[PDB]
Structures are given as C-alpha cells and as structure tokens.
Amino acid sequence: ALSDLQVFNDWAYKTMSEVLDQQVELFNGATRGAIILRSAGNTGDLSEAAFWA
Amino acid sequence: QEAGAVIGQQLAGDTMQDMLNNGLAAGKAAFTAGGAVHDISAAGTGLMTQRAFN
Amino acid sequence: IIITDSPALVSGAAETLRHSTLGLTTGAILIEQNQDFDSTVVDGTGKQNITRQY
C-alpha cells in the first residue's frame, strides 16, 4: 500500500522575492515632465538660487 | 550574496516609493500653503467629476 | 490622469477619508537624488554563529 512507501513532498527554492505594492514609474517623460527625477548633488540642506521679481 | 541581492532589489523599489510619496506630500502641502486649494465636498456630494476638474 | 496609491493622497478613514488629487504643470515637482549612497555591512563575533547587519 501507499503507506508502506516513503512519500517525499517536492520542494524548491524559487528565490522569487516580492518588490512593492504601488506603482512609482511616473518620473520625467512618464509625467510629461510634471515630476522631475534628477541625479544631482547639493551641499547643506538648502539649495537656493535667487531671481529677479 | 543572495541576501544582499534581495535587499538591493527591494531597496531599489522602496527608494522610488518613498521618494515619490514625499514628493507628492510636499507638493500637496505647498499647494495648500499657496491657496490653490479647491474642495468639492462642500458643493453637494463629494465625488470626483469633470466639473470638479473644471 | 496618473493613478497612484500613495498614502500622501488619502489622509483619513471611514467617513472622513479625504482623497487629494493634484493638477501639475511642467516641472512642478523636482526630485534630485544626491548620489550620496552609503551601505555598510557590519559583523560580530563571540557567538555560536557569525552575525551580520546591513
């Protein structure tokens, strides 16, 4: 009978991690330019540039 | 190595997530500060409609 | 219309949840990634097994 055999349950490490919930692919062209993602560095905590009123 | 890889990809997702979230929150707060606020719940039932866009 | 389930645009629950929608222009919100990324891996001894942190 099947009880006499030694049943082995198959397993696998598909290592298939979750990423996130909401979609964040809306930058630059994706937002026609509404939201802009650059890669610029800056000093301090403030980066201010004056202009004429 | 694989723990580092998993952390890397999840971090790649979550960095964009919180960067955008903070950007949207800052935009909403700044627009509230600037007076460019229009609420539609005070005008009848509050639900999105083309008239609200206009 | 850009769809986003960002917690910066819900701000409430039950009968006082207040969805907020933004009408943006070109370059309305600016985000710069300051490329100052630093990631450390630190390990400890004195235990039965090595302990790492990220």
Add this chain to the structure above:
Amino acid sequence: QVFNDWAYKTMSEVLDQQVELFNGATRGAIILRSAGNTGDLSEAAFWAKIQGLVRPRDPYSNADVAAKDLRQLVDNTIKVASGTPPINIPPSMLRWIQKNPQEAGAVIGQQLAGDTMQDMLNNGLAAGKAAFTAGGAVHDISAAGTGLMTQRAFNAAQRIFGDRSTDIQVWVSHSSPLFDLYDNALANAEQLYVFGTVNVRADAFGRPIIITDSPALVSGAAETLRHSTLGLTTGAILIEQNQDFDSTVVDGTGKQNITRQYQAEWSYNLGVNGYAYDIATGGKAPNPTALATAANWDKISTSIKDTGGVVLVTK
C-alpha cells in the same frame, strides 16, 4: 593569496595525530567526498528485502493463500555543524621576542586546516563506533588473558561479521594495540614468526592496520582503559563537506582594544553504511557526544553483513 606565508621560525605545532585516513590511505573505507546539500538531513529510500519471498508449497492441498507486501527503507545522512571559537589575534603586542604578530591569520589558517581534518576524522570514528555498538556488532576482549591477542582477536571480529567476512579489508586502531601486537610478535609463544617478519602491519588475512590516536578509540584510565579498534568495509563511513566555509575578522575597537577576532564556520554530512541517525531521539545539529551516543543510530539494513563495520574492544 595568503598575505604572509609560513617561514621556518613559524613552525607552529601542526598536530599530533595522523589524519590522512581517507580513501586510498584507508582503501576507501572512510571516504571524504564533497557534495553540498540543503537542510539538516539527506535521506534516500531503497527497497527492502522481502522476508518470505520463497515459501514451501503443498500442491495437493489448496488450503489458504498467504498475503505478502513490499516495503521501503530509508537511508539517512545527518549534517554536523562545526565552528571555531573567537580567536584573539594579538594587537601588535607580541613583538619583543617574536618577529611580528600579524602572521596570526596564516598560523590560524594552517592549524585550522589540520584541526578540521582531525575533527572530521574523530567525528566519523565516534559515529562509526556508536553505530556499530547499536548494531550489536561489538566484540569485547577484556576478561580473556592480558586483554589483547596477536591475531586471535581479529578472527573473533571476522567470525561476528560472518560468511561475508572477506569484504572487511581495513582495521583502524589506536597505537597502543599496535604496540601490544608488536610486543607479542617479538615474543612469539607459538613459533610462527621470524625476525624478518615481526614488523607486519597486517592481520594474517591481508587486512592492513592503520594507526591513529583519535580519542574516540580510547577511554578511561588504568584498569578502566579500553582501546576500541573497529574494522571497516568498503565505504563504511561517509563524510561529505558542504563547501561552505565562512570567515570574518572584526575589530571591536571599543572594548579596551581593537581586538582582532577570527571566526569560522563549516558543516559536513556524516553517514554510516547500513545505519540511520535517529533525529527524533537525537537532535537537528548533533554534537560529538550526540554522535557518539548509542540509540541515536538505528540499523537499517536487515542483515548485519550489509551493515559495514565491526568494533573490537581491548584493554
């Protein structure tokens, strides 16, 4: 690749026990294959031998009809985890008489290779002894005469192993039984020796004797001192690494010194032919005492001849 190679002065005492007892040195009785595997076990199933496969028959009488069923056995291979205590590399202080202390990494590496070899051999031998004790294949010689015989002791072990005694081809033993064998060979009460042949390492049957001073083969002291020599078949004891050596060096600067600490982990699989580890009775990660403890090893093969090994105990 090593930052500093070992010089003549850096003759760190490597080890005191011979640990080259794998495959060809042991005629394949103790193998040291390399195969990584997951989990804390690696079990395999093979078909058991049917007991009443052939039965007497009475053609004249129909009478009843017997019913027979075929089962499946389960081989097993436990995984033993080992490690290195945190090693305090001297903080550039051992310098007045030593040339330099920074070669601690190299000396640890070399001594650690030696000590992991000895550790694997000791664990394999202790597990083999415990399994063979569990299997009922132990011969005790402590009350007969002095305690060890020249070859009449080996013949008892082959008697126990039975009609298939020919396949035992290796004896592992402590050095004290070998020296007693030499003493009785150099003192031949039965004149079957000549001076040219008194240094034989065999056992009058073609089985060589391999000598190691592993503490798993010696216990007690004085009158309680028993030496355990165990004869192995082909591939009786299996030791498989998982090729997962780990290391780290941490400078705990705060605790009164940088305190270079060295850690290491490695795990290997151990399995005795014809036996299985009783993980329910033992543990997921057994210690050398757990491996050496009887009733943690369960005999699988029905016939003792299929189980590979026999333990001979002499004082």
Add this chain to the structure above:
Amino acid sequence: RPYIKFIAAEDILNWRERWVNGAKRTTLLVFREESDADDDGYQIYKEEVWRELRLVDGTYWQRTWRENDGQLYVDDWISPTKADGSQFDEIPFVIFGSKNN
C-alpha cells in the same frame, strides 16, 4: 551577422578554471548585460540581463537570465554552431588585461 561585444571590468561576475586532460579551460563564465527594454512606458528602472556561458565535455553552451517583478526567467540551453557546424570546444570570450589574457 556576428557581433563583438565589450564587457566592462565590473560586469564580469563569475568564471572557472577546470583542467580537462590537463588543458587550462574556461568552463563557466557569467557576465552582466545592461539594456533599456524597448517598451512604451517610461522605465525609470534599468533592465539587467545575465548571460551564462558554459563548457561541457568540450562543447560550448549558453543561456540568458532575465528578471521582472522580482521573478527570474531561464532560457533553454542553446549550443551555437559555426558556419560548417561542429559547434565549439571553447567559450568565445576573452578577458583581456594589463598582465595577460
């Protein structure tokens, strides 16, 4: 048409040196291939492609690993062949350096 690629020094990830009949052979070789997938939406992400090159019993095999949504895809082994055929005996990849190739 055949193509000659350039792989950055940071994009070589794995290699092996197993002697077959006492001959220095490169059996395994994995390198990272970088590309922006041709799609419609703006992909702020970088699409990463891993190419696996293997040598079994003196035969060259290769396959491609591609990821998406955290998933990993594996393509079937393909053994590229010369114009006449006969497949290969060595991986068509050289790691050039200052000291030696």
Add this chain to the structure above:
Amino acid sequence: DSNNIKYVREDAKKMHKLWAHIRMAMEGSRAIKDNAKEFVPHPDNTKAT
C-alpha cells in the same frame, strides 16, 4: 555601493550642473563674477547674515 545592485545612472539630468559650469566658464568673467556664490563660498556665514 554594490554596483550589481540595481541603479539607473544615464540621463542629462546627471550632467546639467557641470555642463552649465563649463558654459559659464566659456562665457568669460561676466558669468563667473555674476554667479560668484557657488564658486566662492562666503568667508563667514555669521558675517554673511
């Protein structure tokens, strides 16, 4: 730091800063004297207040 971990690093948004600096350096003394602050930090911010 692990470059094998995903990162996107190609767009002119990366390089506008140095491109603009090159442009004003090419312009001459007018632009540099004009946009003095990013090139010449104040001798003291307390005084600068």
Add this chain to the structure above:
Amino acid sequence: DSNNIKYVREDAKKMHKLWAHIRMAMEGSRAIKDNAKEFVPHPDNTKAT
C-alpha cells in the same frame, strides 16, 4: 548551488573597492568630493559627530 546567478567571485568582490577608487579618480573631482569622507580623514572625529 540553487542557481545563484547573481553570484560574484570573492577575489573580484575584493577588487571591486579598488576598481571603484580608480573609476572615481577617472570621474573627476565631483566624485571625489562627494566621497571625500573615505579619502581625507577628519582632523578630529569628535567634531565630526
């Protein structure tokens, strides 16, 4: 095992830091200043806190 496709050899991983240093020297000065904490030691770390 377990099909670890993203694995990197230990020697290459060790050399990655020096590769990054050489590449950053190739970059120019902005990369060095953006990573100056790992090149120029602080005159006193007590202030750096």
